Tab-separated table of all heavy atoms in Angstrom:
chain	number	residue	atom	x	y	z
Q	1	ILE	N	0.846	-1.202	0.010
Q	1	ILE	CA	-0.023	-0.015	0.019
Q	1	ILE	C	0.829	1.246	0.002
Q	1	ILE	O	0.611	2.206	-0.735
Q	1	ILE	CB	-0.955	-0.026	1.186
Q	1	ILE	CG1	-1.769	1.302	1.286
Q	1	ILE	CG2	-0.242	-0.332	2.489
Q	1	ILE	CD1	-2.777	1.283	2.401
Q	2	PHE	N	1.912	1.268	0.816
Q	2	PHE	CA	2.859	2.375	0.853
Q	2	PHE	C	4.265	1.871	0.671
Q	2	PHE	O	4.838	1.215	1.556
Q	2	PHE	CB	2.753	3.121	2.194
Q	2	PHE	CG	1.458	3.816	2.416
Q	2	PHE	CD1	0.768	3.738	3.614
Q	2	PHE	CD2	0.890	4.578	1.393
Q	2	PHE	CE1	-0.420	4.357	3.830
Q	2	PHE	CE2	-0.333	5.199	1.598
Q	2	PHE	CZ	-1.016	5.098	2.823
Q	3	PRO	N	4.900	2.047	-0.490
Q	3	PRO	CA	6.251	1.622	-0.711
Q	3	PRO	C	7.214	2.208	0.314
Q	3	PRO	O	7.145	3.380	0.644
Q	3	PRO	CB	6.579	2.113	-2.103
Q	3	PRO	CG	5.247	2.201	-2.800
Q	3	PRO	CD	4.267	2.642	-1.736
Q	4	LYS	N	8.131	1.374	0.794
Q	4	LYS	CA	9.012	1.770	1.859
Q	4	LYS	C	9.976	2.909	1.470
Q	4	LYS	O	10.135	3.854	2.217
Q	4	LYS	CB	9.864	0.525	2.333
Q	4	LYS	CG	10.844	0.862	3.455
Q	4	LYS	CD	11.560	-0.405	3.950
Q	4	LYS	CE	12.693	-0.760	3.061
Q	4	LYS	NZ	13.768	0.283	3.080
Q	5	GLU	N	10.556	2.856	0.247
Q	5	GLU	CA	11.506	3.839	-0.106
Q	5	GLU	C	10.885	5.081	-0.722
Q	5	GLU	O	11.468	6.167	-0.612
Q	5	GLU	CB	12.492	3.261	-1.154
Q	5	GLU	CG	13.208	1.997	-0.663
Q	5	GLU	CD	14.265	2.250	0.390
Q	5	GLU	OE1	14.669	3.438	0.510
Q	5	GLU	OE2	14.650	1.349	1.102
Q	6	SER	N	9.675	4.990	-1.265
Q	6	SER	CA	9.082	6.126	-2.006
Q	6	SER	C	8.135	6.955	-1.144
Q	6	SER	O	8.050	8.158	-1.316
Q	6	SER	CB	8.333	5.592	-3.240
Q	6	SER	OG	9.227	4.866	-4.057
Q	7	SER	N	7.362	6.335	-0.232
Q	7	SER	CA	6.284	7.035	0.394
Q	7	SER	C	6.763	8.112	1.361
Q	7	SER	O	6.110	9.172	1.487
Q	7	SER	CB	5.375	6.029	1.133
Q	7	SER	OG	4.702	5.197	0.221
Q	8	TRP	N	7.850	7.864	2.086
Q	8	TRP	CA	8.303	8.786	3.123
Q	8	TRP	C	9.725	9.253	2.837
Q	8	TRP	O	10.689	8.621	3.251
Q	8	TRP	CB	8.239	8.093	4.508
Q	8	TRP	CG	6.859	7.664	4.864
Q	8	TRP	CD1	5.863	8.431	5.356
Q	8	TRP	CD2	6.316	6.339	4.715
Q	8	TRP	NE1	4.731	7.708	5.539
Q	8	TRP	CE2	4.941	6.430	5.173
Q	8	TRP	CE3	6.827	5.157	4.250
Q	8	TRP	CZ2	4.119	5.298	5.169
Q	8	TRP	CZ3	6.005	4.008	4.292
Q	8	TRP	CH2	4.690	4.119	4.724
Q	9	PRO	N	9.894	10.402	2.150
Q	9	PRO	CA	11.187	10.943	1.923
Q	9	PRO	C	11.748	11.721	3.083
Q	9	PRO	O	12.999	11.911	3.161
Q	9	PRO	CB	11.019	11.825	0.677
Q	9	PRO	CG	9.590	12.272	0.783
Q	9	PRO	CD	8.824	11.143	1.431
Q	10	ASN	N	10.898	12.268	3.942
Q	10	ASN	CA	11.316	13.128	5.042
Q	10	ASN	C	11.499	12.374	6.371
Q	10	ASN	O	11.680	13.039	7.396
Q	10	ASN	CB	10.334	14.293	5.206
Q	10	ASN	CG	10.251	15.167	3.993
Q	10	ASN	OD1	11.132	15.156	3.157
Q	10	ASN	ND2	9.161	15.934	3.868
Q	11	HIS	N	11.351	11.071	6.358
Q	11	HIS	CA	11.496	10.290	7.583
Q	11	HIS	C	12.415	9.093	7.356
Q	11	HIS	O	12.574	8.632	6.250
Q	11	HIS	CB	10.090	9.833	8.040
Q	11	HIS	CG	9.137	10.951	8.304
Q	11	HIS	ND1	8.319	11.498	7.371
Q	11	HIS	CD2	8.890	11.659	9.442
Q	11	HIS	CE1	7.582	12.460	7.877
Q	11	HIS	NE2	7.919	12.592	9.151
Q	12	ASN	N	12.975	8.592	8.480
Q	12	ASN	CA	13.953	7.496	8.445
Q	12	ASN	C	13.236	6.148	8.510
Q	12	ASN	O	12.625	5.851	9.492
Q	12	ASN	CB	14.959	7.633	9.553
Q	12	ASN	CG	16.212	6.858	9.292
Q	12	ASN	OD1	16.242	5.995	8.402
Q	12	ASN	ND2	17.280	7.141	9.994
Q	13	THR	N	13.336	5.397	7.408
Q	13	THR	CA	12.751	4.077	7.296
Q	13	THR	C	13.625	2.920	7.788
Q	13	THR	O	13.160	1.787	7.884
Q	13	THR	CB	12.322	3.800	5.854
Q	13	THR	OG1	13.559	3.655	5.061
Q	13	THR	CG2	11.542	4.968	5.290
Q	14	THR	N	14.905	3.176	8.085
Q	14	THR	CA	15.836	2.090	8.455
Q	14	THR	C	15.925	1.806	9.964
Q	14	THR	O	16.211	0.660	10.339
Q	14	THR	CB	17.208	2.341	7.898
Q	14	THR	OG1	17.497	3.748	7.930
Q	14	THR	CG2	17.295	1.869	6.441
Q	15	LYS	N	15.742	2.787	10.835
Q	15	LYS	CA	15.999	2.630	12.245
Q	15	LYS	C	15.020	1.701	12.943
Q	15	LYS	O	15.225	1.329	14.072
Q	15	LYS	CB	16.029	3.992	12.971
Q	15	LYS	CG	16.596	4.027	14.367
Q	15	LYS	CD	18.031	3.489	14.390
Q	15	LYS	CE	18.550	3.460	15.843
Q	15	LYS	NZ	19.895	2.888	15.889
Q	16	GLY	N	13.943	1.312	12.251
Q	16	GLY	CA	12.898	0.493	12.788
Q	16	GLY	C	13.150	-0.967	13.115
Q	16	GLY	O	12.412	-1.827	12.616
Q	17	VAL	N	14.120	-1.328	13.924
Q	17	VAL	CA	14.378	-2.696	14.344
Q	17	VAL	C	14.413	-2.799	15.840
Q	17	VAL	O	14.987	-1.929	16.502
Q	17	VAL	CB	15.643	-3.274	13.700
Q	17	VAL	CG1	15.554	-3.240	12.178
Q	17	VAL	CG2	16.882	-2.498	14.144
Q	18	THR	N	13.817	-3.827	16.384
Q	18	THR	CA	13.718	-4.075	17.835
Q	18	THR	C	14.219	-5.470	18.177
Q	18	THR	O	14.146	-6.368	17.338
Q	18	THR	CB	12.300	-3.859	18.378
Q	18	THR	OG1	12.313	-3.911	19.805
Q	18	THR	CG2	11.377	-4.922	17.834
Q	19	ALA	N	14.671	-5.618	19.417
Q	19	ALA	CA	15.204	-6.895	19.838
Q	19	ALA	C	14.080	-7.942	20.043
Q	19	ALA	O	14.324	-9.126	19.873
Q	19	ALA	CB	16.024	-6.762	21.159
Q	20	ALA	N	12.872	-7.452	20.346
Q	20	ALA	CA	11.744	-8.415	20.512
Q	20	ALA	C	11.384	-9.112	19.222
Q	20	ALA	O	11.119	-10.298	19.204
Q	20	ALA	CB	10.584	-7.682	21.123
Q	21	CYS	N	11.381	-8.339	18.127
Q	21	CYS	CA	11.083	-8.887	16.810
Q	21	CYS	C	12.440	-9.221	16.081
Q	21	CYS	O	12.762	-8.588	15.075
Q	21	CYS	CB	10.229	-7.931	16.010
Q	21	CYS	SG	8.768	-7.359	16.885
Q	22	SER	N	13.083	-10.223	16.617
Q	22	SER	CA	14.429	-10.578	16.090
Q	22	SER	C	14.286	-11.781	15.150
Q	22	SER	O	13.604	-12.788	15.492
Q	22	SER	CB	15.367	-10.899	17.242
Q	22	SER	OG	14.723	-11.587	18.291
Q	23	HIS	N	14.947	-11.702	14.012
Q	23	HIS	CA	14.996	-12.805	13.027
Q	23	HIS	C	16.432	-13.092	12.685
Q	23	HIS	O	17.203	-12.150	12.390
Q	23	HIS	CB	14.184	-12.461	11.807
Q	23	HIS	CG	14.152	-13.555	10.770
Q	23	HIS	ND1	14.703	-13.415	9.524
Q	23	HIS	CD2	13.644	-14.818	10.828
Q	23	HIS	CE1	14.504	-14.556	8.857
Q	23	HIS	NE2	13.890	-15.395	9.612
Q	24	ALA	N	16.791	-14.391	12.677
Q	24	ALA	CA	18.169	-14.801	12.332
Q	24	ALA	C	19.217	-14.142	13.231
Q	24	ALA	O	20.286	-13.769	12.765
Q	24	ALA	CB	18.472	-14.589	10.898
Q	25	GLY	N	18.889	-14.001	14.520
Q	25	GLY	CA	19.807	-13.400	15.489
Q	25	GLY	C	19.948	-11.890	15.431
Q	25	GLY	O	20.460	-11.322	16.415
Q	26	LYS	N	19.505	-11.235	14.390
Q	26	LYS	CA	19.591	-9.759	14.295
Q	26	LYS	C	18.215	-9.148	14.489
Q	26	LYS	O	17.203	-9.790	14.137
Q	26	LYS	CB	20.169	-9.333	12.933
Q	26	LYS	CG	19.668	-10.112	11.725
Q	26	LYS	CD	20.591	-10.029	10.575
Q	26	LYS	CE	20.337	-11.053	9.514
Q	26	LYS	NZ	20.862	-12.413	9.940
Q	27	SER	N	18.155	-7.947	15.043
Q	27	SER	CA	16.944	-7.265	15.278
Q	27	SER	C	16.278	-6.927	13.929
Q	27	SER	O	16.903	-6.413	13.000
Q	27	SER	CB	17.181	-6.010	16.071
Q	27	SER	OG	17.710	-6.298	17.306
Q	28	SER	N	14.935	-7.162	13.853
Q	28	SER	CA	14.150	-6.932	12.667
Q	28	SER	C	12.840	-6.359	13.087
Q	28	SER	O	12.634	-5.925	14.206
Q	28	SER	CB	14.041	-8.229	11.828
Q	28	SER	OG	13.614	-7.946	10.501
Q	29	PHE	N	11.874	-6.376	12.144
Q	29	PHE	CA	10.556	-5.785	12.429
Q	29	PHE	C	9.514	-6.555	11.604
Q	29	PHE	O	9.849	-7.464	10.833
Q	29	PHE	CB	10.509	-4.297	12.120
Q	29	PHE	CG	9.409	-3.565	12.881
Q	29	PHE	CD1	9.253	-3.763	14.226
Q	29	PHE	CD2	8.552	-2.742	12.194
Q	29	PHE	CE1	8.247	-3.056	14.896
Q	29	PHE	CE2	7.534	-2.071	12.892
Q	29	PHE	CZ	7.388	-2.230	14.211
Q	30	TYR	N	8.242	-6.130	11.739
Q	30	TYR	CA	7.183	-6.756	10.975
Q	30	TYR	C	7.344	-6.520	9.479
Q	30	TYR	O	7.828	-5.467	9.073
Q	30	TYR	CB	5.820	-6.173	11.448
Q	30	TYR	CG	5.497	-6.340	12.904
Q	30	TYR	CD1	5.680	-5.303	13.792
Q	30	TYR	CD2	5.041	-7.569	13.421
Q	30	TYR	CE1	5.392	-5.430	15.129
Q	30	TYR	CE2	4.762	-7.707	14.761
Q	30	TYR	CZ	4.923	-6.651	15.599
Q	30	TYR	OH	4.638	-6.810	16.965
Q	31	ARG	N	7.000	-7.540	8.714
Q	31	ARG	CA	7.117	-7.421	7.256
Q	31	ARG	C	6.057	-6.601	6.626
Q	31	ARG	O	6.191	-6.130	5.528
Q	31	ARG	CB	7.140	-8.849	6.631
Q	31	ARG	CG	8.111	-9.806	7.277
Q	31	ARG	CD	9.554	-9.379	6.995
Q	31	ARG	NE	10.520	-10.377	7.429
Q	31	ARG	CZ	11.398	-10.187	8.437
Q	31	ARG	NH1	11.421	-9.046	9.103
Q	31	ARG	NH2	12.234	-11.165	8.730
Q	32	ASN	N	4.944	-6.379	7.342
Q	32	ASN	CA	3.792	-5.604	6.814
Q	32	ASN	C	3.733	-4.189	7.439
Q	32	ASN	O	2.835	-3.464	7.095
Q	32	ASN	CB	2.489	-6.352	7.057
Q	32	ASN	CG	2.337	-7.579	6.248
Q	32	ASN	OD1	2.761	-7.659	5.093
Q	32	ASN	ND2	1.796	-8.645	6.850
Q	33	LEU	N	4.658	-3.863	8.323
Q	33	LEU	CA	4.650	-2.547	8.983
Q	33	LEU	C	6.019	-1.911	8.873
Q	33	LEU	O	7.046	-2.569	8.711
Q	33	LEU	CB	4.301	-2.707	10.472
Q	33	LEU	CG	2.874	-3.132	10.826
Q	33	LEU	CD1	2.712	-3.328	12.323
Q	33	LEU	CD2	1.869	-2.125	10.278
Q	34	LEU	N	6.033	-0.560	8.842
Q	34	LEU	CA	7.240	0.230	8.768
Q	34	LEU	C	7.315	1.148	9.991
Q	34	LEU	O	6.424	1.934	10.232
Q	34	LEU	CB	7.293	1.033	7.491
Q	34	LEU	CG	8.670	1.621	7.149
Q	34	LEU	CD1	9.753	0.554	7.158
Q	34	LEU	CD2	8.647	2.374	5.842
Q	35	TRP	N	8.458	1.066	10.722
Q	35	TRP	CA	8.662	1.922	11.903
Q	35	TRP	C	9.355	3.171	11.389
Q	35	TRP	O	10.530	3.171	11.044
Q	35	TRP	CB	9.528	1.176	12.905
Q	35	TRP	CG	9.498	1.766	14.262
Q	35	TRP	CD1	9.075	3.054	14.652
Q	35	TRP	CD2	9.865	1.145	15.514
Q	35	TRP	NE1	9.252	3.217	15.972
Q	35	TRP	CE2	9.675	2.055	16.541
Q	35	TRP	CE3	10.325	-0.157	15.820
Q	35	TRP	CZ2	9.961	1.749	17.868
Q	35	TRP	CZ3	10.609	-0.430	17.164
Q	35	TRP	CH2	10.413	0.498	18.151
Q	36	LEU	N	8.618	4.306	11.413
Q	36	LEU	CA	9.133	5.573	11.012
Q	36	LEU	C	9.638	6.360	12.221
Q	36	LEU	O	8.933	6.459	13.262
Q	36	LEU	CB	8.069	6.400	10.350
Q	36	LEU	CG	7.580	5.916	8.959
Q	36	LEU	CD1	6.554	6.876	8.392
Q	36	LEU	CD2	8.778	5.794	7.997
Q	37	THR	N	10.875	6.811	12.104
Q	37	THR	CA	11.541	7.591	13.142
Q	37	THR	C	12.013	8.908	12.552
Q	37	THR	O	11.960	9.132	11.355
Q	37	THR	CB	12.700	6.801	13.831
Q	37	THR	OG1	13.620	6.397	12.792
Q	37	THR	CG2	12.161	5.610	14.546
Q	38	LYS	N	12.584	9.772	13.379
Q	38	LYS	CA	13.017	11.082	12.950
Q	38	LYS	C	14.215	10.929	12.015
Q	38	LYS	O	15.105	10.073	12.211
Q	38	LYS	CB	13.372	11.984	14.124
Q	38	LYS	CG	14.518	11.567	14.989
Q	38	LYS	CD	14.761	12.545	16.118
Q	38	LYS	CE	15.941	12.180	16.995
Q	38	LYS	NZ	16.160	13.144	18.093
Q	39	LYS	N	14.261	11.804	11.001
Q	39	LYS	CA	15.390	11.834	10.037
Q	39	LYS	C	16.215	13.077	10.283
Q	39	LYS	O	15.679	14.220	10.171
Q	39	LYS	CB	14.847	11.815	8.616
Q	39	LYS	CG	15.926	11.773	7.520
Q	39	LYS	CD	15.282	11.844	6.160
Q	39	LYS	CE	16.347	11.799	5.053
Q	39	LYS	NZ	15.703	11.882	3.700
Q	40	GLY	N	17.481	12.896	10.538
Q	40	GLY	CA	18.359	14.027	10.816
Q	40	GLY	C	17.966	14.809	12.050
Q	40	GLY	O	18.142	16.036	12.060
């Protein structure tokens, strides 16, 4: 519905990983949700 790279140019799409949602030993997040945080 909202492409990860295109929809939000003014917000940081990469910082969204948590230890609770960990996959393959590294922190990850939901595949259907995007955690938006402050950019710069």
Side-chain angles (χ1 to χ4, degrees):
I1 174 177
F2 294 135
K4 179 176 81 65
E5 304 288 341
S6 303
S7 291
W8 300 280
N10 299 341
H11 300 91
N12 200 345
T13 70
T14 37
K15 193 58 183 177
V17 299
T18 188
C21 307
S22 38
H23 181 244
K26 44 202 162 283
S27 299
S28 197
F29 203 49
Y30 301 102
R31 309 292 188 247
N32 293 321
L33 292 176
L34 193 54
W35 197 340
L36 290 182
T37 55
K38 64 179 181 180
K39 182 184 181 180

